[PDB]
Amino acid sequence: MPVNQIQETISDNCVVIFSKTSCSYCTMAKKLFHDMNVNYKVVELDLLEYGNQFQDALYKMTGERTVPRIFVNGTFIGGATDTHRLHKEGKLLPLVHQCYL
Ligand SMILES: N[C@@H](CCC(=O)N[C@@H](CS)C(=O)NCC(=O)O)C(=O)O
């Protein structure tokens, strides 16, 4: 069940980016975490056999189906635009640090 695997992945990784391989928003979100020296897990929905079902479950969980859907410490933070805003505000690295602490 995709909803289970989603929950498993976000619980087992500090940062998860549900992504597609040719999405410019996703590339930007990867770039942001990379530039912060934060390790992330990428799930490429376009390469998964049931990625459509994953995208459905991400809609049900988060309220929207667009990629990227980004989780930090098991908490949905937004898409690419939200993540950049949270980073600009100094809200993102504290969430990353809760993970470890
Ligand atoms: N406002 C969103 C924009 C994301 C977005 O529009 N993503 C496109 C892919 S580039 C999308 O998900 N399109 C529909 C789809 O692939 O299902 C964000 O900042 O994350």
Side-chain angles (χ1 to χ4, degrees), residues 20 22-26 55 65-69 78-82:
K20 290 178 179 168
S22 68
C23 174
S24 61
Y25 292 98
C26 294
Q55 222 178 334
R65 52 161 28 240
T66 58
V67 283
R69 301 280 81 185
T81 301
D82 298 303

Side-chain angles (χ1 to χ4, degrees), residues 4 21 33-34 69 71 74-75 80 89 98:
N4 302 334
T21 55
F33 285 109
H34 176 86
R69 301 280 81 185
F71 299 75
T75 292
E89 289 170 1
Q98 287 177 33

